[PDB]
Amino acid sequence: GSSGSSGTGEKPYKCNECGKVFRHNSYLSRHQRIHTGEKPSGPSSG
Numbered sequence: 001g002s003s004g005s006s007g008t009g010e011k012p013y014k015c016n017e018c019g020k021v022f023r024h025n026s027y028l029s030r031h032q033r034i035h036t037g038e039k040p041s042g043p044s045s046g
């Protein structure tokens, strides 16, 4: 799971939820999606 307070990769774009690394942000943002998604707790955006 989340084993590592701070991770350093060879790419400027790396996921924190899983840890995987990507080349472009687009792929990162779209990917992170698989993580996000849950009941609304606090008002962030609307």
Ligand SMILES: [Zn+2]
Binding pocket: 015, 016, 017, 018, 019, 020, 031, 032, 035
């Ligand atoms: Zn991820």
